[PDB]
Amino acid sequence: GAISSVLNDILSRLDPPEAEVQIDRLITGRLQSLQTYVTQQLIRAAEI
Amino acid sequence: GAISSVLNDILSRLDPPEAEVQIDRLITGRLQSLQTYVTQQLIRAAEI
Amino acid sequence: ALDPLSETKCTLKSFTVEKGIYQTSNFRVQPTESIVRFPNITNLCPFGEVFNATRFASVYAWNRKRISNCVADYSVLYNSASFSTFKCYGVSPTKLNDLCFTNVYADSFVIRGDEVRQIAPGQTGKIADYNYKLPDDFTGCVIAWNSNNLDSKVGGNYNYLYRLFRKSNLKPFERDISTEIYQAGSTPCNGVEGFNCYFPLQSYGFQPTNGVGYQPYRVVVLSFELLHAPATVCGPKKSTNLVKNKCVNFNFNGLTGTGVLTESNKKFLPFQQFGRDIADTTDAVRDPQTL
Amino acid sequence: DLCFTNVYADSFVIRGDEVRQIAPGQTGKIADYNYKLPDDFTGCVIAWN
Amino acid sequence: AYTNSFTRGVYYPDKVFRSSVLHSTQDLFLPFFSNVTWFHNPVLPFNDGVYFASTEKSNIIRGWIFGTTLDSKTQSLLIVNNATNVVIKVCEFQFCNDPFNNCTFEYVSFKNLREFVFKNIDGYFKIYSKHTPINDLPQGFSALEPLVDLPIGINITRFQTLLAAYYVGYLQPRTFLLKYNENGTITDAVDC
Ligand SMILES: *[C@@H]1O[C@H](CO)[C@@H](O[C@@H]2O[C@H](CO)[C@@H](O)[C@H](O)[C@H]2NC(C)=O)[C@H](O)[C@H]1NC(C)=O
Ligand SMILES: *[C@@H]1O[C@H](CO)[C@@H](O[C@@H]2O[C@H](CO)[C@@H](O)[C@H](O)[C@H]2NC(C)=O)[C@H](O)[C@H]1NC(C)=O
Ligand SMILES: *[C@@H]1O[C@H](CO)[C@@H](O)[C@H](O)[C@H]1NC(C)=O
Numbered sequence: 001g002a003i004s005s006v007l008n009d010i011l012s013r014l015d016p017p018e019a020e021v022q023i024d025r026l027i028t029g030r031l032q033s034l035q036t037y038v039t040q041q042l043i044r045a046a047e048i
Numbered sequence: 049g050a051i052s053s054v055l056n057d058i059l060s061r062l063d064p065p066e067a068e069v070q071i072d073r074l075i076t077g078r079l080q081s082l083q084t085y086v087t088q089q090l091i092r093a094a095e096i
Numbered sequence: 097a098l099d100p101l102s103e104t105k106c107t108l109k110s111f112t113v114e115k116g117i118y119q120t121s122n123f124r125v126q127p128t129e130s131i132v133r134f135p136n137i138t139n140l141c142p143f144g145e146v147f148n149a150t151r152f153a154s155v156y157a158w159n160r161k162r163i164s165n166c167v168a169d170y171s172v173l174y175n176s177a178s179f180s181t182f183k184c185y186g187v188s189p190t191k192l193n194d195l196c197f198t199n200v201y202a203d204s205f206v207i208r209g210d211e212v213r214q215i216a217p218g219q220t221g222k223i224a225d226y227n228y229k230l231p232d233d234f235t236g237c238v239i240a241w242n243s244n245n246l247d248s249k250v251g252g253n254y255n256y257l258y259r260l261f262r263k264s265n266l267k268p269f270e271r272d273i274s275t276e277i278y279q280a281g282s283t284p285c286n287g288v289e290g291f292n293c294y295f296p297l298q299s300y301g302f303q304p305t306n307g308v309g310y311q312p313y314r315v316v317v318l319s320f321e322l323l324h325a326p327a328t329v330c331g332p333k334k335s336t337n338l339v340k341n342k343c344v345n346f347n348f349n350g351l352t353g354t355g356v357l358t359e360s361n362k363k364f365l366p367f368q369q370f371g372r373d374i375a376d377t378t379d380a381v382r383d384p385q386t387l
Numbered sequence: 388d389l390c391f392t393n394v395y396a397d398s399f400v401i402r403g404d405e406v407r408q409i410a411p412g413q414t415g416k417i418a419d420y421n422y423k424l425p426d427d428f429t430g431c432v433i434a435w436n
Numbered sequence: 437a438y439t440n441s442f443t444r445g446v447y448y449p450d451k452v453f454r455s456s457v458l459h460s461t462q463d464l465f466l467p468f469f470s471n472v473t474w475f476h477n478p479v480l481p482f483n484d485g486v487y488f489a490s491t492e493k494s495n496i497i498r499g500w501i502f503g504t505t506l507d508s509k510t511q512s513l514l515i516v517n518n519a520t521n522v523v524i525k526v527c528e529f530q531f532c533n534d535p536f537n538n539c540t541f542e543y544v545s546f547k548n549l550r551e552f553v554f555k556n557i558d559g560y561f562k563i564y565s566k567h568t569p570i571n572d573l574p575q576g577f578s579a580l581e582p583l584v585d586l587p588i589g590i591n592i593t594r595f596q597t598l599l600a601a602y603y604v605g606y607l608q609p610r611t612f613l614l615k616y617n618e619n620g621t622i623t624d625a626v627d628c
């Protein structure tokens with residue numbers, strides 16, 4: 001839901017206040033993605 | 049946190065820019081709900 | 097940050113650290129230089145042609161000028177005091193000097209003051225619906241300024257029109273110049289006006305004595321084409337020399353990144369601008385000023 | 388119901404249409420060159436004709 | 437007549453170099469094993485895009501007209517290669533019924549098989565082309581490299597050929613998985 005997946009693009013196109021909203025969306029998404037990864041790995045490790 | 053749980057209500061009542069925000073809240077909630085379900089199921093499957 | 101053991105102490109939030117190996121930090125090489133490389137074009141973009149145009153088009157028949165293959169000095173616009181509205185969506189005016197674009201479209205027209213707000217993403221009303229629609233994901237700058245001195249006269253200027261009726265809302269940048277008789281009812285008009293058969297257009301009442309809401313405003317909308325092609329419309333930003341085999345902060349056609357630039361052995365085809373990866377990560381570039 | 392260590396009353400005069408520039412994260416002559424509020428401004432702006 | 441485009445009509449979707457990767461892209465492509473109407477001059481409609489293949493050893497086919505009414509008072513694009521120059525113009529031309537001003541653009545540049553994709557949907561005209569020496573439409577795989585991206589913005593709903601057997605196919609919006617070799621050449625594709 002951010003304007004660009006590239007973090008550098010957001011910063012280069014937008015001023016910090018406006019960029020913050022878009023960066024937050026990326027952070028929320030990326031952090032969720034990594035939590036998903038870690039959780040699956042914990043479960044997978046337990047099986048191993 | 050979206051105005052209506054019904055997706056069709058949001059679309060019919062709100063204009064597209066406003067509707068997108070409300071739909072995003074529903075998506076975020078529903079996606080989280082399903083992730084919760086799947087995670088509990090893998091944990092449960094491992095017990096089985 | 098005194099010593100590594102101290103880093104460890106801070107990591108473990110403990111003054112006493114037990115035997116073991118503890119990951120405390122993440123080393124990275126910092127870039128030594130900043131590289132800017134833009135295509136070596138010297139050609140000012142013909143912004144005056146649009147802004148300083150003697151006559152503007154009616155909003156229903158808004159003119160479109162394409163801008164390409166030139167250096168755009170955006171300062172001329174955002175440092176000017178001529179404009180009441182200079183609203184940029186998805187971009188910042190200051191940042192514009194550092195950006196390249198494949199194409200820019202300058203859509204020029206005239207409206208009344210209270211309708212200026214309709215020139216924005218996801219707005220509604222006569223203008224936004226039937227005359228000129230901006231998309232919800234519009235990445236561009238809208239410029240509007242009062243033109244009461246130019247577009248209004250004693251007696252009322254009626255040269256500027258707007259579409260009053262339409263069977264559906266316009267799609268973004270959809271241009272409708274049709275004069276078909278609007279069938280408001282069930283009876284076909286067959287190009288004949290009458291009951292439930294209206295002419296779709298109507299004049300603006302531009303008098304100098306009109307309320308600021310009803311006074312004429314000249315509006316130029318800039319749409320930046322962020323597409324994968326050689327970028328032609330670039331800012332005034334100066335290119336510097338290329339540095340290889342060093343960690344540098346490089347900028348090719350407004351593409352920021354930090355990396356080590358090395359001569360590549362990749363067999364790029366003539367058209368290919370830049371290379372990506374298995375992971376879809378940019379990993380090769382063709383220089384703008386050099387092949 | 389609120390206490391604070393210090394309160395700063397910044398007073399000045401502008402034209403009507405520029406009142407909108409006296410707010411966090413605004414742009415224009417006033418917000419850029421005359422008086423800039425922080426993005427995280429926590430206070431009250433009072434303006435009257 | 438009709439022939440099948442076994443796996444013809446694949447072009448490079450963008451100017452990105454990819455090597456030794458399978459990349460999935462959604463674009464206007466010629467569907468695999470699709471019918472190509474064979475011609476031996478007609479006002480054929482332009483849809484989303486069109487694919488042109490001409491098998492012409494003596495090279496009779498010089499160019500194409502692309503337009504709506506293909507006549508005065510509608511800007512109608514003309515491409516006419518004549519020896520060295522592939523003259524391109526978008527004037528409101530008054531064409532002949534059987535051919536063989538207001539210029540908003542102008543550019544100047546059977547063993548012989550030339551494959552061409554014309555797509556006007558980006559809003560600027562895109563040409564992709566490849567020439568392959570051959571022995572109907574051949575069975576095999578080729579990737580078409582883009583030639584010109586004319587920023588003309590001409591509305592085109594119909595096209596004609598200026599003249600030699602030529603096969604015409606219509607591009608449709610399909611997802612394609614493309615195989616890139618070590619050199620980044622598309623060597624295989626899958627119509628999903
Ligand atoms: C491109 O031009 C064609 C041909 O003039 C337009 O198609 C016409 O559209 C009108 C309105 O729907 C119809 O009344 C005609 O019957 C259509 N003619 C044909 C031959 O299809 C088309 O709308 C134009 N497109 C654009 C982008 O302006
Ligand atoms: C990528 O390009 C290289 C260079 O043209 C190809 O390697 C050549 O392959 C041909 C045919 O087998 C040989 O005759 C040449 O001797 C090779 N040249 C070199 C420099 O090694 C390579 O085959 C290409 N990749 C593919 C699979 O098409
Ligand atoms: C339009 O004219 C004014 C007055 O001469 C000038 O300051 C401005 O720069 C012009 N627009 C251009 C050339 O961008």
Ligand SMILES: *[C@@H]1O[C@H](CO)[C@@H](O)[C@H](O)[C@H]1NC(C)=O
Nearest residue numbers: 135136137335384385386387
């Ligand atoms: C300017 O452009 C030409 C393009 O052919 C190139 O030869 C030359 O090296 C360029 N100069 C700079 C500033 O790099």
Ligand SMILES: *[C@@H]1O[C@H](CO)[C@@H](O)[C@H](O)[C@H]1NC(C)=O
Nearest residue numbers: 438439440468469470471472
């Ligand atoms: C091609 O056309 C023939 C005749 O209409 C038809 O029988 C056949 O199924 C078609 N094949 C396709 C869809 O490529």
Ligand SMILES: *[C@@H]1O[C@H](CO)[C@@H](O)[C@H](O)[C@H]1NC(C)=O
Nearest residue numbers: 508509510511528537538539
């Ligand atoms: C060709 O140009 C003239 C002069 O600008 C113009 O009046 C006419 O509308 C144009 N062509 C047509 C028939 O649309």
Ligand SMILES: *[C@@H]1O[C@H](CO)[C@@H](O)[C@H](O)[C@H]1NC(C)=O
Nearest residue numbers: 517518519520521522523544
């Ligand atoms: C091809 O056409 C162009 C434009 O009319 C002309 O200048 C050129 O001489 C022609 N070449 C020939 C005759 O092959």
